[PDB]
Nucleic acid binder design. Structure first.
Ligand SMILES: [Mg+2]
Ligand SMILES: [Zn+2]
Ligand SMILES: [Zn+2]
Ligand SMILES: [Zn+2]
Ligand SMILES: [Zn+2]
Lengths: 44, 49, 44, 114, 82, 135, 49, 257, 420, 484, 67
RNA sequence: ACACCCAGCCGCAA
C-alpha cells in the first residue's frame, strides 16, 4: 500500500487512515506504485 | 510569468502552452470575446416595416 | 454571465470549456469571437 | 471490439474442411472448388495453370468477400476429362515447376558465390 | 350479401398478399395443418409461398367498403397478381 | 384538351416497347407480309378497352365515369394500335397481336391503384423531397 | 401545459415519436460485394440484439 | 498442358538486396512469388512482452509495439523452431520460442539510450541486428525499464512485424511492348532501369503475339534474413502450401469416391 | 498610404495550416478549418502529468512535407497532428467508393496512425449525513446492498484499482460504499466498450478537505475500418477496408500506397490544392527540404514543381505506373502517387457504435433512456412514423411505437371512461 | 431447465439472412427506410451496397444510420413483402428508378462499354466468374482470328437479364447525327440500342443506367420483375468493379493542365472581356449608355457587365473543353455522369468565374469600394468579385477573399434553409397523414370526405406509369390522314 | 514522439538512422546528401527521416515521478 | 440477481 508523493519520491508507508502527506516534503499530492501483479502485453 | 523554459519544465508546466485561460475547479475555462454595437457613435438605420 | 438569480437576463455562452484535442484547437479557441444573435444578414 | 484474430486468416478451426467439391449443374462436366482459408496467392496460380491446359474450357476464381478468407474456383473440361483430375494435374505440374525453380536458383547462387 | 352483386376488384392485391402470407406462416409455425405436399421445406415463409402458388389458402378475406357493409372473398376465386 | 402541343404524357403501359417486345419475341420479319386481318385488330382493341375498367358498373353514370377516367389511355391505345399503323410500321402476326392484348391487359391491371395505399402521406413526402434541393 | 407543448414534450416527444428498444447505430462504409438487399452487420450488434 | 521451364539469372547479390530475372514464366506465378516474399516467409520476432516495471516517459504499449517491430536475425532456426500453436508445449518452451530479457537503468545526467544492443537473448543464434543499433526509448536519470519478452515464429499475414523484406520491387516488360499500360503522352515518361530503347524511341512496337515474361525482382531484406535465403524460404513455403493442398484434395476426392 | 505585411496573413490559426488554400474551393477550406480542431496529436507536451476527460495522443506525428510559412510561427512543427503518408488517388476494388478510404493493414500494423485514448475518472468523499458517510473500501458480498456480478477482487484494500492492471468493460475501479441510514455500494464502474488499462492513480484532498481520487485509463486504438480520416483540403473519409501489403498495388520501385482515396472526391468538390500538395510533397521528399507552400506566392506554381519532379526522375505530372496487387498485371491507367498530410480525427467507430435490447428504462416515460453511455435506445422520430405510414406497414409501426417501446395494460370502466 | 417443448419462444441472436430496416435522419422521403437481409461481417461497422447510397441521401464519410429489427412473424412478413428494397426499386414520386449505378461502377461501365475495349480469354473467364445469373456457357467471342478477343459490350449483354428492349442516347450525342446519314451507325458510338436483351451499340452513362426515366434499369424492373432487377444491379457492380481492377481509374495534375495554346487563347479571351467592360464603363462615365426600357441606369449597366462576363466565362469554358484531351480523366468522369460537371472543368482549367453574393456582385462594404486595395468608385471586373485566375493557376488574395464570400453564402443558405424546409414538409405530412384510398377506389379524408373520386383522376398508382408520346396530337391534318 | 522503428510504407529499418542523421547534419551536410549517405534511396524512407520531429527531448525535461 | 436523479448550459458529428 506504499504511496509515492509528488516531487521528493519517498515510498512512504501509510496504512493508517490519516491525512495523506509525507514527512519529507509535505506536498499534498500522492501516487501509488505500479502493481506487482504481472500482466501480458500483446505486441500486435 | 517570467519563468524560462527550464523552470517551466521543472515546474511540470508545458513551455509551449500559450496560457490565456482560467482554472476554475480544475476545468480550464477560456473567455470568448463578445461583439456589441460600438458605444458613443451616432448611427442611422432604416427599419423596413 | 451576470448575477446567479437573474439567469433570465444573463447572457449565456461565455467562458466555454477550453478545447484540448490539439494544439491548433487550443490556439483557435483562445483566439475566438462570438455574436449575441440567437435572417442571413448578420451571419454573412 | 470485433477485430478478428490475425491467426484466423489462415488457420482452420475444428469444424470445416480445406477442400469441398460441388458439381455445378448449369453446364455438364463442371466443378466448383471451394479452397478455404486461402487468398489470391493461390487462386491466381491455379487459374493461370489451369488456363494453360489445352483441354479445359473454363477456368477462373473469385473471392466472395475480401474479409472472409475463402476462394471459389470453377473448372470446366471437355466430356472426356474430369475437372478433379485436371486440378490434380495442374497442381503436379506446379510442384514440378517450383521444385525446378528452387533447384536452378540453388545452382545460380552457387555459381555466383565464386 | 349473396353470391350475386359481388362488385370489387378480383385482383388480390399486395397488402392482403402480405397479410395472408404472414398469418399463414405464423399459423404453420404454431403446428397447423399443411394444405399441400412438401418436399423437404422447413421455413414457414417458403412453404406459405408454395401453398399459395398451389392456391389452397384456408382463409377468406373480409373487405370493408367505406359505407360499412362487408364483402367476403375466398382466396381460391381470387387470381394471383404474379 | 392539350394545348401547346405537349405530346409528352404519362400513361401506364409503354405500348411502343410492348409492340417491340412482341416483334423480337415472335421473330416477326417486317419485310414479309403479315397475316393479321384489320377487323381482328378492331374488335381486339375494342374488347380490350371493354375489359379495362376503373369504375366498375353498368349504370349510365358509372359508365360515363369509366369512360372519362380511361379516355386518355383508350385514345392513346387506339392511336398506337391503328389498323394502318399495325399493317405498315409494326407488321405483327395474329399470335403476336393476341399476346400483345393479353400483356397490355395484365400490365394495366397491375398498374391499377391498390386500395389501402396512404396516398396522402406519399404525396406529401414526394412533394416535400425536392424542397431540400431547391437551394 | 409546457409538459404537453411541442418539441421536447409529451405529445410529439413521447407519443408520436418515441424511443424504442431493439435498435442499433454505427457508421457506414462501402462494400460492393453484397447484393442490394443484403447488408453487413458486425458481430457485436448481432450478439447483443 | 505441362508446366513451363522457368530460368533465373542473378545480377546483384549484396548483403541486403538481391536483383534477379525470371524468364519463361506466367505472370500469376511471379505475382504470387512476390506475395509470398512479403506475406508467407517465416521469421522470428517478438510477440509476447511482459513489462516488469516501466518508468520511462513512453507507456507500456508503446514499448511493446516498438520491441515487436525490432528485427531478429533468424537465418538458421526459422525451420527448426515450430509454431507455438503446433508445439505440444504449454505456453512457451525454448523449443518453440526465444526468450528475451531487458534490464537498463539510467543513473547519470547524460541521457541514456535504450538501444537494441541492450536486448539480451538466450540462444546466441537469435539476436537483434547488431553483429548502428536500433533505438527503443530514451531515459532520464532515475527512469528504469525492466521487461521480459518471448519471440515466436510467424509470417507476414498475421502482422507486419513478421514481414522480412524491406520492400519488394517487381517490374516486367520495362519498355512497354504489350500495351498493358497505355501512355497518353509516351515521350513524357522516364525510361525504366531495365529498358532497351534508344533516346529517340519512347516505347517498343506493339506485339500482338507477345505474352508477359522476363520479370525483374529487387527483393531487399530488412537485415533479419539474408536476401537470398529469403527467396529459397519463399519458394519452399509455396511448395509446402501446394503439397498440403495436394494432400487435402486427395483426401477429399477419395472420400467422395 | 500603406502596404500589406503579407497577403497570406488574413488566414486564421486553424486555416493557416492548409497548404495552397487559394487553390482549394472555399467551402472545403472552411470544412478543413473545422477539422483542424479535431485533428489529434500531441496536444500538449506535459500530457502525462495532466489528466482530464477525453484526452487523446498520437504515436508518430510528423511535421508535414508541404509546410506553410505561418505554421512555423503557430508552433505546429513542435506539436504536429498527422503523418505524411504515401497516397494513391485511384479507384480500386470499390471499398473507397464515395467519400471513403482504403488503408494499409501492414502499415497500420507498423504503428501508422496508432494512437492512445486517455480517459480520466474522479470520485469524491462528499460526506452528507452524520452516519450516512461513504468510505473508500473493498465492498464485501453481503455487507453492501448494491451487489453486481462484476469482478471485485481486482481492487486493493483502499478500494482503488491499482495502476497497470488490465480492466474490461463494466468493471469496478473505485470501491466506495455508503453506510445505510449495513452499507450500500455507491461505486462507479468503467463504462461500456473501452477494454483499457489503468495507468496512473491519484489521491488528494479536495477543496473542502475530504479525500479525493482520480484515475486515468488508457487504451491503444489501432485504426479499425470505421475511423474518420481527412486531409488538409476537406477530404472527409472513412476506412472502408484495410488491405495487407500484398493486396494493394505497388510501383516499379516497390513503393506501395498507405492510403487510397477515390478520384470521385476531387472533381465535384474542387480541391486541386490536394493534388498540388501531393506533387509538392513528392518533389520535396525526393529533394531534401520541406516544401514551401505559402498561399500567395508567384514564385511557386505547378510548372516549376513539375520541372523539378521531371529532373528527379518521375512523370512530370506526378503519375506513376502501378501494378495490380492481386493479379500482378499492370494497371491500364497510371495512378497519381505521392505523399501528403493526413489527420486522424476524434471520431472513432468504437465510440459511436451502439446497440440496445430491452435495456434500462426511463423512470418517467417508462421508455428507453438517452445516450449510449446510459445504454439507451434510439428514437423513432415523427418523420420515421410518417415514412412507415407511407410504406403501409401497419403492424410494424404498431409494434415499433407500442410493443417494442413500452407495452402497458390498464383497466377502464365501461359506463364512464375513467381509469379504474 | 433448458428443455424446449412446443409453444416456447427462444430469443436467438441475429443470424445471417434475417430481415432488418435502416434509417438515416433526416428521413426526407419514404425511400429512407427500406428492408435489408442481414449478413455478418467482421469489424464493427455496417456495410451496405453502393447504389443504396442515393436512396438514403448519404455519403460514406462518418454518416451513421439506425437498424430496427422486427420482432414478430407478421412484422417480418410485411416488411419482406413491402419494404424490401428489391420490390421497391422504382419510387412513385417521379415514376423513375431512384436506384442507380454510381461512382466507380458507372465510370467503369462507360470505359468498359467503349468500342476500343477488348478482353483476352483469361480476363473474360475472370469476369464471368463474378456473375451470378450466368448460364455457364461462354458466348462466342466477337473476334476469332488471329486470337480470341471479347468485347465489353458482349459481357454487358450477358449481364442484361431476360430480353429487354431499350433505346437511349449517350450524353455526348451529336445533334447532327440524327438528321444526317449514319443515323444507325453513329460514328461516335452514341444511340445506345439494346435488342433482345443484348447490347448492340453505344456507350452507357448516367442517361442510360442512372436515375432517369426510361432508363435501362427502369425497363428491367417494369418488364422482368423485381428479383431479377436486384440480380442485375449486383452483377453490374461486381463485374464492373473486378474489371476496373484491371483497367483502373485515377485523377491527377496531368488531368488539370491544358495545352499552352489553350492558355494563350484563354488569356486573350479574358483580356478582350476586360477591355470590353472597360469600354462600357467608360461609356457609362461619359453618359452615353442609353437606359434599357423598364430598367434603371445602374440596373442596365450591371446587366450589361454581367452579360459580358458570362459570355467570357462561357467562351473560356468551351475553349477549355475543346482542348480537353480524350484520355483526360475529368472528361471521362463528367461525360459518364458519375460526379462533377463541365462547369467544374471550366473552373478548374480556365476561369473560376464571377463570384456573386445574393445575386448581385460583391457589395460596397467600405466607402464605395469592395476592399482597401482597390481605388474608390470602381466597377471593373477584378474589383467587384470576378476571378480571372483558375484553381490550378492559383487565386490572388482579393479574388480569394471574394471567393470565400461566395462559399460563405453557399454555406449560409444551405444551412439556414433546412429549418424552413423541415417545417414545410412537417406541415404537409401532418395535413395529409390520414388521406388514403378506400376499397371503393375513392380517395377520402379521415372522416370520409371524398377528396378525389379516383386516385390521380384515373385510379393508377405512380410506380407503374411511364413517359410516352401520343403520336396523334402533333401531326398535321394531311399527315394524320396519310398515316391513319 | 520518437523515430519509428520501421518505415510505414515498405518496412526498411529506420530507428537506427536518427542519431546518424543528426550527426551528418551537424557536419555541414545538407539534408539530401545526408539521406543519400544513409542509403535511403526510396523516398518514403526519406520523408520518414526528414518529416519526423522528436518530441522526446522535450519530454525528458520533466523529472520522473519515481526515483 | 444489476446500478447510475433531474434540469440547464455548451461544444460537436451527418
Ligand atoms: Mg456526409
Ligand atoms: Zn514528498
Ligand atoms: Zn513449446
Ligand atoms: Zn366508471
Ligand atoms: Zn520506406
Amino acid at each position: 500500500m506504499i504511496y509515492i508523493c509528488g516531487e521528493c519520491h519517498t515510498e512512504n508507508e501509510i496504512k493508517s487512515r490519516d491525512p495523506i502527506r509525507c514527512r519529507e516534503c509535505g506536498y499534498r499530492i500522492m501516487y501509488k506504485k505500479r502493481t506487482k501483479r504481472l500482466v501480458v502485453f500483446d505486441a500486435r | 510569468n517570467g519563468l524560462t523554459d527550464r523552470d517551466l519544465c521543472e515546474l511540470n508546466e508545458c513551455p509551449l502552452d500559450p496560457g490565456g485561460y482560467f482554472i476554475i475547479n480544475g476545468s480550464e475555462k477560456v473567455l470568448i470575446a463578445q461583439e456589441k454595437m460600438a458605444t458613443n457613435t451616432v448611427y442611422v438605420f432604416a427599419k423596413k416595416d | 454571465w451576470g448575477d446567479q438569480k437573474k439567469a433570465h437576463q444573463a447572457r449565456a455562452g461565455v467562458s466555454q470549456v477550453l478545447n484540448r484535442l490539439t494544439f491548433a484547437s487550443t490556439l483557435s479557441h483562445l483566439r475566438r469571437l462570438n455574436s449575441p444573435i440567437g435572417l442571413a444578414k448578420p451571419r454573412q | 471490439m470485433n477485430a478478428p484474430p490475425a491467426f484466423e486468416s489462415f488457420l482452420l478451426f475444428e469444424g470445416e474442411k480445406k477442400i469441398t467439391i460441388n458439381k455445378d449443374t448449369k453446364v455438364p462436366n463442371a466443378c466448383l472448388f471451394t479452397i478455404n482459408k486461402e487468398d489470391h496467392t493461390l487462386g491466381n496460380i491455379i487459374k493461370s495453370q489451369l488456363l494453360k491446359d489445352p483441354q479445359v474450357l473454363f477456368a477462373g476464381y473469385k473471392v466472395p468477400h475480401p474479409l472472409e478468407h475463402k476462394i471459389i474456383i470453377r473448372v470446366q473440361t471437355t466430356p472426356d476429362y474430369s475437372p478433379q483430375e485436371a486440378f490434380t494435374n495442374a497442381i503436379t505440374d506446379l510442384i514440378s515447376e517450383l521444385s525446378l525453380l528452387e533447384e536452378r536458383f540453388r545452382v545460380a547462387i552457387k555459381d555466383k558465390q565464386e | 350479401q349473396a353470391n350475386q352483386k359481388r362488385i370489387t376488384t378480383p385482383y388480390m392485391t399486395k397488402y392482403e398478399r402480405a397479410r395472408v402470407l404472414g398469418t399463414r406462416a405464423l399459423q404453420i409455425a404454431m403446428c397447423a395443418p399443411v394444405m399441400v405436399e412438401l418436399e423437404g421445406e422447413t421455413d414457414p415463409l417458403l412453404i406459405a409461398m408454395k401453398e399459395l402458388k398451389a392456391r389452397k389458402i384456408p382463409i377468406i378475406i373480409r373487405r370493408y367498403l367505406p359505407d360499412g357493409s362487408y364483402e367476403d372473398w375466398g382466396v381460391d376465386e381470387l387470381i394471383i397478381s404474379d | 384538351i392539350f394545348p401547346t402541343g405537349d405530346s409528352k404524357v404519362v400513361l401506364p403501359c409503354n405500348l411502343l416497347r410492348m409492340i417491340w417486345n412482341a416483334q423480337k419475341i415472335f421473330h416477326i420479319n417486317p419485310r414479309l407480309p403479315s397475316d393479321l386481318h384489320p377487323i381482328k385488330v378492331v374488335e381486339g382493341v375494342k374488347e380490350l378497352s371493354k375489359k379495362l375498367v376503373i369504375v366498375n358498373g353498368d349504370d349510365p353514370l358509372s359508365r360515363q365515369a369509366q369512360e372519362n377516367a380511361t379516355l386518355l389511355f383508350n385514345i392513346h391505345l387506339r392511336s398506337t394500335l391503328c389498323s394502318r399503323r399495325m399493317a405498315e410500321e409494326f407488321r405483327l402476326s395474329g399470335e403476336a397481336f393476341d399476346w400483345l392484348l393479353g400483356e397490355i391487359e395484365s400490365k394495366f391491371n397491375q398498374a391499377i391503384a391498390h386500395p389501402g395505399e396512404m396516398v396522402g402521406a406519399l404525396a406529401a413526402q414526394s412533394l416535400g423531397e425536392p424542397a431540400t434541393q431547391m437551394t | 401545459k409546457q409538459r404537453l407543448k411541442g418539441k421536447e414534450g409529451r405529445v410529439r416527444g413521447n407519443l408520436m415519436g418515441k424511443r424504442v428498444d431493439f435498435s442499433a447505430r454505427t457508421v457506414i462504409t462501402p462494400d460492393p460485394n453484397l447484393s442490394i438487399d443484403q447488408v453487413g452487420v458486425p458481430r457485436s450488434i448481432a450478439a447483443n440484439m | 498442358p505441362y508446366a513451363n521451364q522457368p530460368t533465373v539469372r542473378i545480377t546483384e547479390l549484396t548483403d541486403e538486396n538481391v536483383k534477379f530475372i525470371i524468364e519463361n514464366t506466367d505472370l500469376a506465378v511471379a505475382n504470387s512469388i512476390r506475395r509470398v516474399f512479403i506475406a508467407e516467409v517465416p521469421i522470428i520476432a517478438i510477440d509476447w512482452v511482459q513489462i516488469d516495471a516501466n518508468s520511462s516517459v513512453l507507456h507500456d504499449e508503446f514499448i511493446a509495439h516498438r520491441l515487436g517491430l525490432i528485427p531478429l536475425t533468424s537465418d538458421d532456426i526459422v525451420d527448426k523452431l515450430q509454431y507455438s500453436r503446433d508445439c505440444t508445449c504449454e505456453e512457451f518452451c525454448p523449443e518453440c520460442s526465444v526468450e528475451f530479457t531487458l534490464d537498463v537503468r539510467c543513473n547519470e545526467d547524460q541521457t541514456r539510450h535504450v538501444t537494441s544492443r541492450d536486448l539480451i537473448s538466450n540462444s546466441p543464434r537469435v539476436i537483434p541486428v547488431t553483429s548502428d543499433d536500433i533505438l527503443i526509448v530514451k531515459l532520464r536519470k532515475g527512469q528504469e525499464l525492466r521487461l521480459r519478452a518471448y519471440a515466436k515464429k510467424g509470417f507476414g499475414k498475421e502482422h507486419a512485424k513478421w514481414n522480412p523484406t524491406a520492400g519488394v520491387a517487381f517490374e516486367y516488360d520495362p519498355d512497354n511492348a504489350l500495351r498493358h499500360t497505355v501512355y497518353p503522352k509516351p515521350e513524357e515518361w522516364p525510361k525504366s532501369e531495365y529498358s532497351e530503347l534508344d533516346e529517340d524511341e519512347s516505347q517498343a512496337p506493339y506485339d500482338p503475339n507477345g505474352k508477359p515474361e522476363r520479370f525483374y525482382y529487387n527483393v531487399e531484406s530488412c537485415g533479419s534474413l539474408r536476401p537470398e535465403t529469403i527467396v529459397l524460404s519463399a519458394l519452399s513455403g509455396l511448395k509446402k502450401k501446394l503439397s498440403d493442398l495436394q494432400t487435402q484434395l486427395s483426401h477429399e476426392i477419395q472420400s467422395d469416391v | 498610404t500603406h502596404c500589406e505585411i503579407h497577403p497570406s496573413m488574413i488566414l486564421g490559426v486553424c486555416a493557416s495550416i492548409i497548404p495552397f488554400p487559394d487553390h482549394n474551393q472555399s467551402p472545403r477550406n472552411t470544412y478543413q478549418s473545422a477539422m483542424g480542431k479535431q485533428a489529434m496529436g500531441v496536444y500538449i507536451t506535459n500530457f502525462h502529468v495532466r489528466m482530464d476527460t477525453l484526452a487523446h495522443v498520437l504515436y508518430y506525428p510528423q511535421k508535414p512535407l508541404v509546410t506553410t510559412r505561418s505554421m512555423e510561427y503557430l508552433r505546429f512543427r513542435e506539436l504536429p497532428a498527422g503523418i505524411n503518408s504515401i497516397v494513391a488517388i485511384a479507384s480500386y476494388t470499390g471499398y473507397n467508393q464515395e467519400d471513403s478510404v482504403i488503408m494499409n493493414r501492414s502499415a497500420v500494423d507498423r504503428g501508422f496512425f496508432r494512437s492512445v485514448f486517455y480517459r480520466s475518472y474522479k470520485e469524491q468523499e462528499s460526506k452528507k449525513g452524520f452516519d450516512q458517510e461513504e468510505v473508500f473500501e473493498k465492498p464485501t458480498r453481503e455487507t453492501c446492498q448494491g451487489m453486481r456480478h462484476a469482478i471485485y477482487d481486482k481492487l486493493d484494500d483502499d478500494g482503488l484499482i491499482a495502476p497497470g492492471v488490465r480492466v474490461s468493460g463494466d468493471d469496478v475501479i473505485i470501491g466506495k460504499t455508503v453506510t445505510l441510514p449495513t452499507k450500500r455500494d455507491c461505486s462507479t464502474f468503467l463504462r461500456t466498450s473501452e477494454t483499457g488499462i489503468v495507468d496512473q492513480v491519484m489521491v488528494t484532498l479536495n477543496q473542502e478537505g475530504y479525500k479525493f481520487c482520480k484515475i486515468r485509463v488508457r487504451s491503444v486504438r489501432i485504426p479499425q475500418i470505421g475511423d474518420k480520416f481527412a486531409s488538409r483540403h476537406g477530404q472527409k473519409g472513412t476506412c472502408g477496408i484495410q488491405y495487407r501489403q500484398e493486396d494493394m498495388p505497388f510501383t516499379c520501385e516497390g513503393i506501395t500506397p498507405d492510403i487510397i482515396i477515390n478520384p470521385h472526391a476531387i472533381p465535384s468538390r474542387m480541391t486541386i490544392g490536394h493534388l498540388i500538395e501531393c506533387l509538392q510533397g513528392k518533389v520535396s521528399a525526393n529533394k531534401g527540404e520541406i516544401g514551401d507552400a505559402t498561399p500567395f506566392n508567384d514564385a511557386v506554381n505547378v510548372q516549376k514543381i513539375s520541372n523539378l519532379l521531371s529532373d528527379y526522375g518521375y512523370h512530370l505530372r506526378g503519375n506513376e505506373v502501378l501494378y495490380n496487387g492481386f493479379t500482378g498485371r499492370k494497371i491500364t491507367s497510371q495512378i497519381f502517387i505521392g505523399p501528403t498530410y493526413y489527420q486522424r480525427l476524434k471520431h472513432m467507430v468504437d465510440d459511436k457504435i451502439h446497440s440496445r435490447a430491452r435495456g434500462p428504462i426511463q423512470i418517467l416515460n417508462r421508455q428507453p433512456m438517452e445516450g449510449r453511455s446510459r445504454d439507451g435506445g434510439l428514437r423513432f422520430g415523427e418523420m420515421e412514423r410518417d415514412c412507415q405510414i407511407a410504406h403501409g406497414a401497419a403492424q410494424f409501426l404498431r409494434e415499433r411505437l407500442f410493443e417494442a417501446s413500452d407495452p402497458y395494460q390498464v383497466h377502464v370502466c365501461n359506463l364512464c371512461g375513467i381509469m379504474a | 431447465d433448458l428443455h424446449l417443448q412446443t409453444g416456447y419462444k427462444v430469443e436467438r441472436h441475429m443470424c445471417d439472412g434475417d430481415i432488418v430496416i435502416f434509417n438515416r435522419q433526416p428521413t426526407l422521403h419514404k425511400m429512407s427506410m427500406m428492408g435489408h437481409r442481414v449478413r455478418i461481417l467482421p469489424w464493427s461497422t455496417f456495410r451496405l451496397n453502393l447504389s443504396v447510397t442515393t436512396p438514403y441521401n448519404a455519403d460514406f464519410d462518418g454518416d451513421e444510420m439506425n437498424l430496427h429489427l422486427p420482432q414478430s412473424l407478421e412484422t417480418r412478413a410485411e416488411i419482406q413483402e413491402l419494404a424490401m428494397v428489391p420490390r421497391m426499386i422504382v419510387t412513385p414520386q417521379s415514376n423513375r428508378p431512384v436506384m442507380g449505378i454510381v461512382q466507380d461502377t458507372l465510370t467503369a461501365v462507360r470505359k468498359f462499354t467503349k468500342r476500343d475495349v477488348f478482353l483476352e480469354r483469361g480476363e473474360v473467364m475472370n469476369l464471368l466468374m463474378f456473375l451470378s445469373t450466368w448460364d455457364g456457357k461462354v458466348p462466342q467471342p466477337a473476334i476469332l482470328k488471329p486470337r480470341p478477343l471479347w468485347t465489353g459490350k458482349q459481357i454487358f449483354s450477358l449481364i442484361i437479364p431476360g430480353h429487354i428492349n431499350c433505346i437511349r442516347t449517350h450524353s455526348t450525342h451529336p445533334d447532327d447525327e440524327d438528321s444526317g446519314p449514319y443515323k444507325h451507325i453513329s460514328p461516335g458510338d452514341t444511340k445506345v440500342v439494346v435488342e433482345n436483351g443484348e447490347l448492340i451499340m453505344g456507350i452507357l452513362c448516367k442517361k442510360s443506367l442512372g436515375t432517369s426515366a426510361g432508363s435501362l434499369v427502369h425497363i428491367s424492373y417494369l418488364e422482368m420483375g423485381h428479383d431479377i432487377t436486384r440480380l442485375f444491379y449486383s452483377n453490374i457492380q461486381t463485374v464492373i468493379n473486378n474489371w476496373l481492377l484491371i483497367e483502373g481509374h485515377t485523377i491527377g495534375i496531368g488531368d488539370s493542365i491544358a495545352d499552352s495554346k489553350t492558355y494563350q487563347d484563354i488569356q486573350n479571351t479574358i483580356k478582350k472581356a476586360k477591355q470590353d467592360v472597360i469600354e462600357v464603363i467608360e461609356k457609362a462615365h461619359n453618359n452615353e449608355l442609353e437606359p434599357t426600357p423598364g430598367n434603371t441606369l445602374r440596373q442596365t449597366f450591371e446587366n450589361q457587365v454581367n452579360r459580358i462576363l458570362n459570355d467570357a466565362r462561357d467562351k473560356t469554358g468551351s475553349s477549355a473543353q475543346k482542348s480537353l484531351s480524350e484520355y483526360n480523366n475529368f472528361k471521362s468522369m463528367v461525360v459518364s455522369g458519375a460526379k462533377g460537371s463541365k462547369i467544374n472543368i471550366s473552373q478548374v482549367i480556365a476561369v473560376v468565374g464571377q463570384q456573386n453574393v445574393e445575386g448581385k456582385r460583391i457589395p460596397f462594404g467600405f466607402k464605395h469600394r469592395t476592399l482597401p486595395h482597390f481605388i474608390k468608385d470602381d466597377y471593373g471586373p477584378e474589383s467587384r468579385g470576378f476571378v480571372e485566375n483558375s484553381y490550378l493557376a492559383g487565386l490572388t488574395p482579393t479574388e480569394f477573399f471574394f471567393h470565400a464570400m461566395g462559399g460563405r453564402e453557399g454555406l449560409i443558405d444551405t444551412a439556414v434553409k433546412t429549418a424552413e424546409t423541415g417545417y414545410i414538409q412537417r406541415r404537409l405530412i401532418k395535413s395529409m397523414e390520414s388521406v388514403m384510398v378506400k376499397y371503393d377506389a375513392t380517395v377520402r379524408n379521415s372522416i370520409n370526405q371524398v377528396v378525389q373520386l379516383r386516385y390521380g383522376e384515373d385510379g393508377l398508382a405512380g410506380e407503374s406509369v411511364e413517359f410516352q408520346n401520343l403520336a396523334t396530337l402533333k401531326p398535321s391534318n394531311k399527315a394524320f390522314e396519310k398515316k391513319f | 514522439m520518437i523515430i519509428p522503428v520501421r518505415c510505414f510504407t515498405c518496412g526498411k529499418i529506420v530507428g537506427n538512422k536518427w542519431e546518424a542523421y543528426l550527426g551528418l547534419l551537424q557536419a555541414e551536410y545538407t539534408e539530401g546528401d545526408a539521406l543519400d549517405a544513409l542509403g535511403l534511396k526510396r523516398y518514403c524512407c526519406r520523408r520518414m527521416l526528414l518529416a519526423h520531429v522528436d518530441l522526446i527531448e522535450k519530454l525528458l525535461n520533466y523529472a520522473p515521478l519515481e526515483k
